[PDB]
Each structure stands twice: as structure tokens, then as C-alpha cells.
Ligand binder design. Structure first.
Ligand SMILES: Nc1ncnc2c1ncn2[C@@H]1O[C@H](COP(=O)(O)OP(=O)(O)OP(=O)(O)O)[C@@H](O)[C@H]1O
Ligand SMILES: [Mg+2]
Lengths: 51, 103, 43, 103
């Protein structure tokens, strides 16, 4: 309800390897960027080009 | 997790000799949300959730869903055949009745 | 008796039509499963 | 595993009093891949995957797959016998009808 999670909240994405947690995080970041807002994606697992 | 406002769990389960993807909101503070384990399927267009499962035995997913749909179609079709055969039977009885009346 | 014969003819034709329809539906369901578990989705 | 780009899991399971081999790609980064637990069988020619399981109850593997195929063949054959017997029955009724007409 409401169209999405409340702004400024902490959102956890849990799952086993290969579930799609990184895909969902990338979706969030891209959606935020498409609206003209800034976004940061701290990655401790992959390089920028590989991602 | 003790602090998180929202929780999204993504599952990749092995059932019926094949792997199916699903996701659900374990908790969403300060709002009401769906309580369904919505199966999704990632593709070039992005992440896309399949239409909600309708009918009894909603746990079925993947090939099992198509198999259940086919089984339902077959059974309901044969029930229709049952009713049609009974109607034809009454057809036959009425034909003899009024032909006898004609004689 | 001729009325009986015509009724029987209708019954035979119903038998053929419905049986062929079952054939068609079985083929369609088999194809659906074949895609659902097929590798042709990529090549 | 936290870093691996691709993951291939090989299973050697004991089911139905016998061991069957299978393998599946747990994850393959940056591409779409099959989500089926493809049973394989190693031999002199090398590693060879069996044709995908088709039909309901795809979990069946090994001897169980052949048994299921045989059961399906038997049942569909007997359904054919059902339909043939009904056709012969209508055969008989039509024969009496037109023989009576001849008299
Ligand atoms: N074009 C595509 N079509 C279908 N599935 C795809 C496609 N591209 C990627 N995938 C799926 O995405 C999966 C990887 O998703 P993702 O990287 O978001 O997972 P993750 O949970 O972050 O993984 P990890 O534990 O490795 O960090 C791949 O295993 C593949 O199954
Ligand atoms: Mg990742």
C-alpha cells in the first residue's frame, strides 16, 4: 500500500546466492537515478565493469 | 535485521526437479502489504512478477502450475461431456415417447 | 427404425469430433510443457 | 562462493534404491540460463546430459522415469480400448436397426 516503502527507511534484501539481491538493489538505484536523484552503490563483491 | 524497517526475502527453491524464483515482504513498517509469496521471473525487461496463483493448491509453481491448469481443463471438459450425454439420453426417451404417440 | 439409425449416426460423429478434440488438447498441453522445460528459449 | 561468477552443483542422490547423477547451474552472472536439474550420465564418450524430463512429476529419474513412461503407455492404450469398445457398441445397435428395417 502507498506505492512503495517509506522514504529514508532501512530496507534489507535477504536471500541465498543467486537469488537476485544485487539485481533488486540495482533496480532501486536505477529507479532513483531515473528521477534525477543521486545514488551510490557500495559493492564489496564485484568490480564496476563486471557489475 | 533487528532495526530494518522493510524486509524483502528472495527465494530460489528446488521443487519438482527444477528451480523456481519467488519473493515476499517479510515485514513493512507503517503500512499494509500483500502477504502472498509472489513468484517472479527475471528477464531482459527486468524483474517481473507472474500473475497471482488462483485456485486451490496455490503452492504449485513452475511446470506444476501448467500441469494443474491442464488437469482442471480436462476434468471440467469431461464433466461437460457427462451432462451432454445425459441430455442426449433424455432426447432419446422423448423421441420414442412422441413417435409412439404418433402411431 | 430409421429415426434410431439417424440418432446412432449423430452419436458416431460426436464420438469422432470429441476424440479428435482430445487429441488436439493433449498435443497443446504437451507443447506447453515442452517449452516450460525446454532449452530452445536460448538457441 | 561469495565471489564466484558461476556455480555448478553436481548431485549424486540415492532415490528408489539406486543412485542417480544430476547437475545444475546455481548461478551464472550476466546471462540467462536454464533452471532445470538436468540429469546426466558419464560414459566413455564423456559427460552427456539426458534429454529433459517431459510430463508431470518431472522429479522422477532413473528407473522411475521408465516406469512412469510404461504406466502412461498402458493407461492411454486402455483409454483407446474404451473408445473402441463404445464405437463397436454403436456398431451393433446400428446393425440391428437396419436389419430390422430390411425385414
Ligand atoms: N537476462 C537474464 N535472463 C534471466 N535470468 C538472468 C538474466 N541475467 C541474469 N539472470 C539471472 O540473474 C542471476 C544473478 O542475479 P544477481 O546477481 O542479482 O544475484 P545475487 O543474489 O546478487 O547473487 P550473488 O550471491 O552472486 O551476489 C543469474 O544467476 C541468472 O540466474
Ligand atoms: Mg551479488
Amino acid at each position: 500500500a502507498g506505492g512503495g516503502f517509506f522514504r529514508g527507511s532501512s530496507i534489507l534484501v535477504s536471500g541465498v546466492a543467486g537469488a537476485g539481491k544485487s539485481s533488486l538493489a540495482a533496480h532501486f538505484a536505477a529507479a532513483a537515478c531515473a528521477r534525477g536523484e543521486r545514488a551510490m552503490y557500495f559493492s564489496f563483491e564485484e568490480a564496476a565493469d563486471q557489475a | 535485521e533487528e532495526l530494518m524497517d522493510g524486509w524483502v526475502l528472495m527465494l530460489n527453491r528446488e521443487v519438482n526437479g527444477e528451480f523456481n524464483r519467488e519473493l515476499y515482504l517479510l515485514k513493512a513498517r507503517g503500512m499494509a502489504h500483500s502477504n502472498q509469496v509472489r513468484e517472479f521471473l527475471m528477464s531482459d525487461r527486468g524483474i517481473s512478477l507472474l500473475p497471482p496463483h488462483l485456485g486451490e493448491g496455490g503452492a504449485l509453481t513452475g511446470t506444476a502450475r501448467k500441469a494443474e491448469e491442464a488437469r482442471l481443463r480436462r476434468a471440467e471438459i469431461e464433466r461437460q461431456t457427462e451432462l451432454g450425454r445425459l441430455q442426449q439420453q433424455i432426447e432419446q426417451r422423448r423421441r420414442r415417447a412422441r413417435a409412439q404417440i404418433e402411431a | 427404425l430409421e429415426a434410431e439409425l439417424q440418432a446412432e449416426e449423430i452419436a458416431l460423429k460426436a464420438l469422432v469430433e470429441s476424440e479428435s478434440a482430445h487429441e488436439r488438447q493433449r498435443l497443446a498441453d504437451a507443447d506447453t510443457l515442452a517449452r516450460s522445460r525446454g532449452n530452445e528459449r536460448f538457441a
